[PDB]
């Protein structure tokens, strides 16, 4: 009689239970759910507002739904950029032409533009799980989707999470199988009796199973998400999770434009910037060259952000951009290792919108290439040229730029 209505509500309530509150439930008017005839329409919806950074327990919800259904199904969850928010939409079967993300353990990031969407179903999730050798024991490794709502964009990351205490989870599955006497069914029937213990269990999957991921150079920083850091060294090329990176754990558009028009003041701050233009003047007056580089204020933004972020010993090289005109810039890192804090990557991406930032390695030197793909008030070229004449430059600095321009004259950004 009423049982069927109760079975469906118990499901949706347990789903809403495990979804963090920042992703607000926004379901409409839903019908009665028949386990033997699961619906094909959308069964739940959760919404994340702009600037939200939260994780969705995609795998747990999928397996909960598969456990509820008394027939074969392939739970599918669609992740959509609404233009003002991220929208998670759940289904028992993937709609006809719904998208499925092409992700793996190592390539796990997805960036959605405005109005676009991606998705994933339990079948694809399981395939990714068995290809990466992930632990398949129930509750040892479940996938979540970390979302960083950064309108007009939505950043996603498909990550496998695990328990802080695996032994505490092996014992839970031991008590669940005892009461019952796949193995997931034992857990879901047991945990159905204690919503509090179910919440505590899902909220306990908070240990990333893959804290670092390899990348291939050249690496476009546009493939990162807001909490990704980047490490380049003799240990390889890796993306990290800002929260779980030991190095990491250890200014809007206005302030950037304000820094460009106020560069003449605190001339020492970008002494290293002007010294590059001197060294570039030799090879082939310097005033028309200085004007061209200042016509690309994003290049100054990058240099300003790098040093505000602690990367004080960087060097910048300017090369004519054959395609877009003007100049591209190489940020040369010192030494044989570099770590870009996740906050720094976020900053340089926002500051240089319209420019591609790509990490390279050339002649034992790590670098970023900044190539062109809101008006900034122009400054007086002559005002900067005159300050450049009065500035003093040590020979070591000028020789450094001599060696660097000679070293990178043969460097060709793959693009
Ligand atoms: Zn880091």
TrEMBL record:
GO BP terms: viral budding from nuclear membrane
Q: Which UniProt keywords apply?
A: Host membrane, Host nucleus, Membrane, Metal-binding, Phosphoprotein, Zinc, Zinc-finger
Listed binding positions for Zn(2+) are 229, 245, 248, 339
Instruction: Tell me what organism the protein belongs to.
Output: Human herpesvirus 3 (HHV-3)
Annotated Gene Ontology MF terms? zinc ion binding
Protein name, per record: Nuclear egress lamina protein
Question: Which region of the full protein is contained in this chain?
Answer: 81 to 333 of 333
């Amino acid at each position: 009689g009423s049982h069927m209505l109760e079975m469906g509500d118990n499901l949706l309530q347990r789903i809403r239970l495990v979804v963090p509150s920042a992703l607000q439930c926004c379901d409409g008017d839903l019908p009665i759910f028949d386990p033997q005839r699961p619906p094909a329409r959308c069964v739940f919806q959760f919404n994340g507002e702009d600037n939200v950074s939260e994780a969705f327990p995609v795998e747990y919800i999928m397996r909960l739904m598969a456990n509820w259904a008394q027939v074969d199904c392939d739970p599918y969850i669609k992740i959509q950029n609404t233009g003002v928010s991220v929208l998670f939409q759940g289904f028992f079967f993937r709609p006809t032409n719904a998208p499925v993300a092409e992700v793996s353990i190592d390539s796990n990031n997805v960036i959605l533009s405005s109005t676009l969407s991606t998705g994933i179903n339990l079948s694809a999730l399981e395939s990714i799980k068995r290809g990466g050798g992930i632990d398949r024991r129930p509750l040892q490794a479940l996938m979540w989707v970390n979302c960083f709502v950064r309108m007009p964009y939505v950043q996603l990351s498909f990550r496998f999470m695990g328990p802080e205490d695996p032994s505490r989870t092996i014992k839970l599955m031991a008590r669940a199988t005892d009461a019952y006497m796949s193995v997931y069914r034992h857990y879901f029937n047991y945990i159905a009796r204690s919503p509090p213990e179910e919440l505590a269990t899902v909220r306990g999957l908070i240990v990333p199973i893959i804290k670092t991921t390899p990348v291939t150079l050249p690496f476009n920083l546009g493939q990162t998400v807001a909490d990704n850091c980047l490490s380049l060294s003799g240990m390889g090329y890796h993306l990290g999770l800002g929260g779980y990176c030991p190095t990491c754990t250890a200014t809007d558009r206005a302030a950037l434009i304000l820094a460009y028009v106020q560069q003449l003041n605190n001339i020492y701050e970008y002494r290293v910037f002007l010294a590059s233009i001197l060294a570039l003047s030799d090879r082939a007056s310097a005033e028309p060259l200085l004007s061209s580089v200042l016509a690309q204020p994003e290049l100054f933004f990058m240099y300003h952000i790098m040093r505000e972020g602690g990367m004080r010993d960087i060097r910048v090289l300017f090369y004519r951009d054959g395609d877009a005109g003007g100049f591209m810039m190489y940020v040369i890192f010192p030494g044989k290792s570099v770590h870009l804090h996740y906050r720094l990557i976020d900053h340089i991406q926002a500051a240089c919108r319209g420019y591609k930032i790509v990490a390279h390695v050339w002649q034992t030197t790590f670098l970023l290439s900044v190539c062109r793909n809101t008006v900034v008030p122009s400054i007086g070229t002559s005002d900067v040229y005159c300050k450049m004449c009065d500035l003093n430059f040590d020979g070591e600095l000028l020789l450094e730029y001599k060696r660097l321009y000679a070293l990178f004259d043969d460097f060709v950004p793959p693009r």
